[model samples]
Target: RWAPIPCSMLENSLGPFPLFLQQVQSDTAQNYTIYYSIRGPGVDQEPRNLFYVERDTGNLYCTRPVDREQYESFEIIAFATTPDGYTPELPLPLIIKIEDINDNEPVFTQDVFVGSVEELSAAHTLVMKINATDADEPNTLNSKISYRIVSLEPAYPPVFYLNKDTGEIYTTSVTLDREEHSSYTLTVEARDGNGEVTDKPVKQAQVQIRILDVNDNIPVVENKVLEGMVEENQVNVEVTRIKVFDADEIGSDNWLANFTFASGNEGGYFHIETDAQTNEGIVTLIKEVDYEEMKNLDFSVIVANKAAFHKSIRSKYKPTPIPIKVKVKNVKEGIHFKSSVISIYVSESMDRSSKGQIIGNFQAFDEDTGLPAHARYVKLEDRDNWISVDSVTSEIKLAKLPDFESRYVQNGTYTVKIVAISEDYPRKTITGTVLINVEDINDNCPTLIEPVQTICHDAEYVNVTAEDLDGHPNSGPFSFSVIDKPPGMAEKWKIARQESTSVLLQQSEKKLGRSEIQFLISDNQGFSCPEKQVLTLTVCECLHGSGCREAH
Candidate 1:
């Protein structure tokens, strides 16, 4: 009779010794010879050998280091032989099982993550999700992961929370203000196997949350009544300034206000401008004031934002339509003038072929007569001579087509100054600004930067690139093709487009010792000339056991 045996052992890194005890038994009383043989992944193989069994003693041994991660168990076969060397009819089978130990720690997918959320959002709002992975066995305690927020910026009552099981971050407080605290940094940790924090291996990552601004407040007039005194002949000048305040973040449209005359003033003699830095309204008299016609100036001013409010408040409580009173005191008639900065936008794609295409108009008004101000020809203060203006109409036009790639154009915008003078009397004049914004057009051609002259015959290809000075449609999505080809050269070499701005010269049918190639690159512009370049590849031979070398 025969019996089968099974063995089990704990994995140890200290030593691969005594991995398993191998034994074989028989009912015969006489002494018999036993032989053992093992065959598996690490057995009977070079360099990968992990286990072996003794032929005479029938004992299994681990000769090299064993990693439970690489191989978990091993199988062995044993047989009994007669003293005369006769083989036994049956063989005994043995199974060895390896137990696992916690050896791996959790690892986060990213060391740092960036996210954003709008301010004034509701509580428990999900900000972002964090992820981590483990290298240990699956479905076991060694592979289990737990997450938590280990540290946070501006920590007090705790503004954020993290889900332990899902690694989801949420806002615990809804009072987040970008104006006060624009961003927060959080350190999150993930632990493997158990939730224990002490002595256990844990991985950490930094989470940065940026708070976006929200339009939550209405503009309120800071100064109710504005007072100023101007001479009777005062033309265009800033008489008084109106101030406003808001609880929202500045620089954004939420706090930036635009003012207009609501009512009370019969004539349109004043214009209000919002100061970019202080957010105050600059009230300027565009027209001259007459003490005889109007002894006092009374108007109701209104302030509003360019962006609508996220939350609505009652109309009665809204800060707008504030009453303003100004006194225009009588003074000796003298020449005084003022003008506000003007802005205009023009497309860079304008047809330059058309002679009379009006780019924009720049006409200043005289506050004294409530009519157009007379002056000499409108002159550009910079005097680059890119534009011209009509002396009578004050209409500005492009003297020549503006190239979007011209050095004079900065970030696609051009600024010029216009001066308007009084026809008679004091001969005083006022200056206003004109902004000419140039739009994009297909006015540029793509060109290759440099060419590759030599390459190894064993190499697959070489890299090439093309660039354009103009942006957008004028720039890329470039195409390349061999413009000039030699006999049978089409089959020997080919130009392939990798992306919009790049190309590759690949060997087609066979490698060549020497060849000349040419290609053209076209921009996405609907109508424009494509660029061209040439390259010479000198393929050199290679020696035995050596790589092919490139020739100059």
Candidate 2:
């Protein structure tokens, strides 16, 4: 029979061959000879024949070794029987458990780990953790793990450390700047022996520590390049674009600038703004500049970031200010008139007195003083010198009455331009236009169009047309007749019809060719041509189509 084996034995125990286990003895074995045997995984099964029994004494022993990692326990049966097929005892059950020792090393959960930290972070700021696992035991020293930075890429400044037991990483020093190095790479090693030095292989992982940006560096102006001038009375003119040198990341809040007109803009005549896309300062004119006023202006601008500065920069983020000087440029303004043009109405028959009368006057004034600044008045352009203007009085008069049919007169309106010279040092000159519209008064008489006609012997009527230079009511309804000078001329030559601008004259004479006749043509308004001369005509064939050679 066997006693109880409460706990398991160590798997790889150091001992001599045939290690002893509990021995079984039968009561019948004292008088009678008995044999012992066992069967299971560790003995006489898959791992065959490792356990054996002393045939005479009924004792058990292991021939070789066993593993706890591969197999935790071995379940087998032991038998006791007499020599000739007679059994001494029933089959007995035995369970053998295995024990563990420190053998396996720790392994990392991942090949690489990543983390982010801001620049200028405080001490002990958590970055990330490096994790590993051990399979030796549940809570003993064999399965316990620890983390440490085995290798840091940038080794000069020791900035990071790790919790040896918790596998957490932190910033050991407060001086973490992204400007120095934005990212850091470290090899973290995990050990299974807690914090002690065990002669074991290491489980390593790559940890990437990225540092974010902050506004630690101040933006300094690069150039004092403010050149060129602003014309008088011109606003919103771009003065200059300021240059800069910044050491922060582009397109970030720490890099984009906000421009301020820190000084020299007391009059509020200028303004400064920032270009978000280009990171530049632009200066422009908000108020109009005067040439007669201050000749030049001086300005100073400051540049800073929009996100405020890093706390390490003890004061405001102010650098050496930009100095700018803008020169004011003077411009020329010629004399100008109150009106660009003027007009007056006058009858075409304006007689003696009104011809020297003032109709309309234009005066020129200085652009600066807004007063009469002209020294003399003169005609710059006119048709036939038909106008007169007073040099000092600025009075305009007619040299003669304006005729409606004149070249410069279109539709009864005559146009002319006059110039005025300034009394200023460099005399400025300007021109003004004057329009003289001639009112119709039936002043012109109607004249004959095609007054001469061949009085052929077979012809009974001659067509006549009249035209007047005057427009509308003064021009039409012509009457034609012969002056009673030659004997019997009135009865033979008379207008059979009177029409607007036209008439037909009937000549009933069957006599020799008449060459002498006077036309008494009159307008509908009773104005007639002042000529009393004869309108000459001759009969054709006898009328000289061939120069009178056909008269045979």
Candidate 3:
């Protein structure tokens, strides 16, 4: 059987609720007022409580809320006092437990806690206020709490510091660098001094900070020497590459390229294109060159950044002009036949070798002195077969040429490759391309074949031809093109070889003739020829029966 709990009315009764002690006669009729005390769960009393029974059987009552509990074992205490105000150490009228009342709630000081201070940022800074409360009376430091760095991870141990009294956090011994670390966090704790005295539960709070930025870096260059070589008549041409060095973390777009003449030879010969995202400068060929006037040219250039913070002490770094020798080779005088890739207006008439008339000029020079140097030469290295350069004077002239496909050239501008020879006595050589731009003129008229000619579909070949009378300088290569043809006749007819001349016609192989066909023929000069010739070589049945689908 389970044991029955032992309890009593006095066991649940609160301490001296109804004044348990009264006046009593002690060795004499000295009336004394006695105070009562209790020790139990309901009351703030402990075991073995003692109180003097000034007068026994004094009526007492207990507070509520402790009725059904706090009885098994308890004790109350009372004290006795003499009329002269002399209280004895002995306790009397000792009662049991006194019930407690549920009349209070947990609270704290200044719930809207706030703490602050104006100071430089560091590893530690007191950011928040510590506050809390308890129902127990007479609460002092023992019930009060303390603060500390809760998660040092935010502070990394001793790096961040916290004050015990003032609750301020500062750098204990950590190096403070706004560049490295800028913010910190800490937890504040509140507790009843060692969990003794009153119930002051532990509570926590947090804080944050920010760091700013500053300039502390220099610019650096990515490459050392930027170089280039251009012709003598070429102006505004870049000779040396320009770039600046900045170690600063700033973006490349912010760092621009600036060029300054170091040799004090600044005749506005060249200019550096600004607004370059990187250390790049555009040196354009803005001016024309005259080798006969100035052979060699030199330029001194210095590259700098836009920051303009410091002057570069290295003046020698300016680009020094390397010598450029323009040698004009001798050639037998004939017609000064062609200008530098001479070009005339398309379909325009121009007098042959006329004064002020430009003719193509093909010439080159050697850079290396003595022997084994580079020079210029001409060959069929591309459309060279379409045009020709005088073998003697390096004069560029017209040869076998096709119709102009302006899509490759813009507004009378053409580019061609010309070979350069090295001074290397025994067969020295080098190759370079010269861009020739042909200007358009409307002095010539386009001609079409009169009465379309017909040829046989199965014929071995058809004789197709045209003519130009401008001579070698003004006219030569007759650009022949297919115009009219019978259905599916394109594959059946083909122009013969050696037909590059402006006036000639011969069958590739014996073949039968079809009714008629048409073709076009124009001069090599884009649109310069004054007149054109178109022919419709009408084919007729031949006596050679072998003309039907014959092989060439």
The TM-score values for the models, in the order shown, are 0.53, 0.55, 0.31
Q: Would you list the clashing residue pairs of candidate 2?
A: 44-49, 539-543, 540-543
The regions of model 1 sitting more than 4 angstroms off are 1-9, 21-33, 46-49, 72-97, 173-175, 199-201, 223-225, 312-319, 333-552
User: Which prediction has the highest TM-score against the true structure?
Assistant: 2
Query: Clashing residue pairs in candidate 1, if any?
Result: 236-338, 287-367, 288-367, 288-368, 348-439
Higher-scoring candidate on TM-score, 2 or 3: 2
- Model 2 stretches astray by more than 4 angstroms: 1-33, 44-67, 75-93, 197-201, 224-238, 262-278, 284-290, 310-323, 331-552
Stretches of candidate 3 exceeding 4 Å from the true structure: 1-138, 141-350, 354-360, 368-376, 381-393, 396-417, 423-552
How should the candidates be ordered by TM-score, best one leading?
2, 1, 3
Error of 1 at 98 (Å): 4.0
Q: Write the per-residue lDDT of candidate 1 for residues 396-503, one digit (tens) a residue.
A: 776766666777777777778876665767766666777767777766676666665556656678777776788776775876666646666666677755787888
- The candidate with the higher lDDT, 2 or 3, is 2
